[PDB]
Amino acid sequence: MKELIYIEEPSILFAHGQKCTDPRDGLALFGPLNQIYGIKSGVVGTQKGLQIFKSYLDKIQKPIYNHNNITRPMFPGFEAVFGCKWESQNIVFKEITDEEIRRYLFNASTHKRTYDLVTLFNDKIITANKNDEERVDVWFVIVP
Amino acid sequence: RYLFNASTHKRTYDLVTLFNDKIITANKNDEERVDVWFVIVP
Amino acid sequence: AQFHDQLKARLLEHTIPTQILRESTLAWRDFKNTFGAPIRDFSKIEGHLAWTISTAAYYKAGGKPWKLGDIRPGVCYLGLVYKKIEKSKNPQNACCAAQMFLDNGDGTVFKGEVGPWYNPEKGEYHLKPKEAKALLTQALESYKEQNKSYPKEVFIHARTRFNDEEWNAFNEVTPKNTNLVGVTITKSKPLKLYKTEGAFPIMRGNAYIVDEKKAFLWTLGFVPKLQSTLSMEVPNPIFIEINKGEAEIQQVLKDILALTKLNYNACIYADGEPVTLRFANKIGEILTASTEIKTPPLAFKYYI
Amino acid sequence: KEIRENTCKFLIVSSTAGNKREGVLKELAVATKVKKHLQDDMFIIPLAIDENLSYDDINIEIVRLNAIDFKKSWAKGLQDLLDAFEKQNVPKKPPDHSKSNLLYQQIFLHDKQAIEKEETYDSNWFPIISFPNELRFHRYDWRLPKQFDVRTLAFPAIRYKEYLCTFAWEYDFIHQLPKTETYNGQESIRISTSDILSGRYDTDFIRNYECQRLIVQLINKAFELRMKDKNVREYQMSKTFAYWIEKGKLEKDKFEKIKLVGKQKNKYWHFGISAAGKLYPSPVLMVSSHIIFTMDGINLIKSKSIQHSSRRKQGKNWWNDKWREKLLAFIRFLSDDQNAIYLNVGSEEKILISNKPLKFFGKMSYVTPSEV
DNA sequence: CTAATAGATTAGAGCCGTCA
RNA sequence: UGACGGCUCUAAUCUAUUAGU
Numbered sequence A: 001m002k003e004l005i006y007i008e009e010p011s012i013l014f015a016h017g018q019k020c021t022d023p024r025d026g027l028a029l030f031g032p033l034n035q036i037y038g039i040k041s042g043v044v045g046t047q048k049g050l051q052i053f054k055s056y057l058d059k060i061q062k063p064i065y066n067h068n069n070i071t072r073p074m075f076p077g078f079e080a081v082f083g084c085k086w087e088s089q090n091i092v093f094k095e096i097t098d099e100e101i102r103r104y105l106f107n108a109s110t111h112k113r114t115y116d117l118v119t120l121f122n123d124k125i126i127t128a129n130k131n132d133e134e135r136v137d138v139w140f141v142i143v144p
Numbered sequence B: 001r002y003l004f005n006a007s008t009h010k011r012t013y014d015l016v017t018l019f020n021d022k023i024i025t026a027n028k029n030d031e032e033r034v035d036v037w038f039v040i041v042p
Numbered sequence C: 001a002q003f004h005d006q007l008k009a010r011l012l013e014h015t016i017p018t019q020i021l022r023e024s025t026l027a028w029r030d031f032k033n034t035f036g037a038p039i040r041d042f043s044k045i046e047g048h049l050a051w052t053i054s055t056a057a058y059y060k061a062g063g064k065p066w067k068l069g070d071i072r073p074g075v076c077y078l079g080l081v082y083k084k085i086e087k088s089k090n091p092q093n094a095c096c097a098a099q100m101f102l103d104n105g106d107g108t109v110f111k112g113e114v115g116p117w118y119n120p121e122k123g124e125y126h127l128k129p130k131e132a133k134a135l136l137t138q139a140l141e142s143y144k145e146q147n148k149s150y151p152k153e154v155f156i157h158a159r160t161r162f163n164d165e166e167w168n169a170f171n172e173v174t175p176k177n178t179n180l181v182g183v184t185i186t187k188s189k190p191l192k193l194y195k196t197e198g199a200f201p202i203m204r205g206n207a208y209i210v211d212e213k214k215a216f217l218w219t220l221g222f223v224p225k226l227q228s229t230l231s232m233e234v235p236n237p238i239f240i241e242i243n244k245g246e247a248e249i250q251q252v253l254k255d256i257l258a259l260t261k262l263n264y265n266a267c268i269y270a271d272g273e274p275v276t277l278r279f280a281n282k283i284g285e286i287l288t289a290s291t292e293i294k295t296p297p298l299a300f301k302y303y304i
Numbered sequence D: 001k002e003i004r005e006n007t008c009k010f011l012i013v014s015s016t017a018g019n020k021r022e023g024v025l026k027e028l029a030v031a032t033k034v035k036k037h038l039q040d041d042m043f044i045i046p047l048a049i050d051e052n053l054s055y056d057d058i059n060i061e062i063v064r065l066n067a068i069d070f071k072k073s074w075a076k077g078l079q080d081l082l083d084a085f086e087k088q089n090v091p092k093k094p095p096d097h098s099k100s101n102l103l104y105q106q107i108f109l110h111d112k113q114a115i116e117k118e119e120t121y122d123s124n125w126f127p128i129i130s131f132p133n134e135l136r137f138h139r140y141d142w143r144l145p146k147q148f149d150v151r152t153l154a155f156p157a158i159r160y161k162e163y164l165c166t167f168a169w170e171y172d173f174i175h176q177l178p179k180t181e182t183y184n185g186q187e188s189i190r191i192s193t194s195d196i197l198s199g200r201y202d203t204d205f206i207r208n209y210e211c212q213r214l215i216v217q218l219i220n221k222a223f224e225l226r227m228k229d230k231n232v233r234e235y236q237m238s239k240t241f242a243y244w245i246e247k248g249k250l251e252k253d254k255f256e257k258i259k260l261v262g263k264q265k266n267k268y269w270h271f272g273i274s275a276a277g278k279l280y281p282s283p284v285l286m287v288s289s290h291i292i293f294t295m296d297g298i299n300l301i302k303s304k305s306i307q308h309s310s311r312r313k314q315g316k317n318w319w320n321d322k323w324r325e326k327l328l329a330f331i332r333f334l335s336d337d338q339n340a341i342y343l344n345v346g347s348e349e350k351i352l353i354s355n356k357p358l359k360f361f362g363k364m365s366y367v368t369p370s371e372v
Numbered sequence E: 001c002t003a004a005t006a007g008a009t010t011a012g013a014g015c016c017g018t019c020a
Numbered sequence F: 001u002g003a004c005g006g007c008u009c010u011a012a013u014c015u016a017u018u019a020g021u
């Protein structure tokens, strides 16, 4: 009679030559393999975006609790799990356009609006990277 | 060639081409993150 | 529609990582009920949000979250998927090489191959005999340069079966006598099945072999550790067919099962299809946004 | 044993409700007494976690002691705890994470993993059991006009190069046109069904693949013909018609302690299915289930998007047990016999399809009584 | 040398929810 | 475009026959 053969779950490798199946508890126990510790970042957007990003960035240091523990492993903290520093006091911000001449009066050919948005963002990022001195690693873009 | 007999300018261009190509391949191919490069010269 | 695609595609030429975050994720407080029905909610899931973000950013910094170590050394791997561009003459020609796994003594390589080779046909897919030779040769010198010797065994994934001529050409570009095999992996085929007793679906990891060639696998059950289902309703399995070559079914099946947890973009315990097919699928639309680029990089940090 | 004979330090934790617990206060008094006994270095090292616990409102007996802070980041608390520990000249031991992994897996291993018990599963397919030994083709190049198509006919009949692919006798078309019998059946053509299903048949004008296509088309149209007179009607679909039934049409909207037509968002919902034949592993019938809405059973919502939202809302709380039981109940109701379903494909010929689905037995399972 | 039927075999492209 | 799954709607082309070269 036709029957079902079963296949077991494999294992993944972690730091210190340890093993586990889920990766979350392994990271909470052993951490990553290679150690890199620079998250000097960059950001563009509006000032309310600045304050909200600062609040969310310095909020993650404290542990945050899921509603149900048994299905989601706990998150103690970024420095608690990774051993890498990431704070809200070393950002190099570049200001965004605020006038936004595009309004409800201009809605025909939204492709042109998208082109203008992307051109503005890309030129700002490229100019900031090319001209300034500080060494940035990642660029976060926020927009409603 | 070891001796600068054929063309010294050609040998310099060949060496800089080799170094530049190796560095560019390293930058565009690998996965790590690096900041500086300390090139030694024989 | 193409905002992110266009932005990343044009910024790709300057070698800069980036990350796009919608404000609603950050500001999920004040976007509450307009007239009594809340717009938005992450209360129940809030902590997991952090697990979704941090490690991803870490990868963009240059960190390796976790690596798999269940691979036989001295073997190959590769994947492929097509794409429709329909630019001028409704061309169907966009093939994006997915990845390749290598053991350079101690490390694992995850850079893959690139280059959207074209094809005059518009609806038949497959591949003209000229492109395939270069396509396989590329992985060949990559293996030579990252192995300081020649590769031993080679595996290939796909999405659709293919005709005799191009596989014959693939065998033509085979150095020495190495074994080559390609496996076709579909996504949806109806084999709905139920559990006789209880109120829970099938338990993850089962199989149902119909022949020495074909096979099946289930991926959305519920792990006992998680104790909860991975899909809201009853699942749908994946149908596996071996096209050519002499490959044992069980080893290839366990290998393709073992490559469904390397989803660096997230941290969910299980994922439906292997990383390769979806990974090439998500790199294709990056390069189809605008085609003026020449020799794009082969590091997936910038793509993702 | 341990508090007196084999303890060196102490790690009291000052939570928000730690003062309430009587057991922790009792063991705290024990620790105070053992400290009053020893008087060597120090024993008690408090810890603080909560933000609500103000630094002054801490437990009354412990106000005399300070505390390393953990309210900001756990990493620095672990760091200064460990370097204070190693400054206190506590005896060491080489680290070994393998023991930690073993302890973690052992303390959390029960009510998980897999169990060697056997269980059973139900499939979605029904295998055929009856079929006439051979089918018949007969074309006169004059029997029928060559312009109208075969959707007009309601009986097995499809065009072909020379072999008109019909199932019933070629003289069973009197109902609207005479002279059918005048077309002599001696010059007819027969092909064995058993052999072509076995696949051994092969000719220069007929191969296996297209005749298999022919027979599956005939069985599909026969399934439609046998379905149409079940008194369950159909709604237009991107795929074939979606077949379903109304409340009240069955006795008091109930059939063997199962309810299929219900109410949601003031709309009445029913449980329909669709089907189609597949043959390669075995001759079986794919059946899939869907949920249909209506305002009063006479009309249905026109917008597909709000229908989509409504069907998701309705199906959010339906699970495996209900799915399986409802499918089995509906297919049993569909069964026109107590044993199988007949398919009157011919004038008198029929194909019997089992109403009982397939089975599967598996040798591996989990901890079933998970309750939630 | 163009067009109606018909199966088997393919890709976009939106909406709901996220565990009773 | 924080990611995953489940459904629904749309498109071609290949493979018999047939009518107009």
Ligand SMILES: [Mg+2]
Binding pocket: C265, C304
């Ligand atoms: Mg991303």
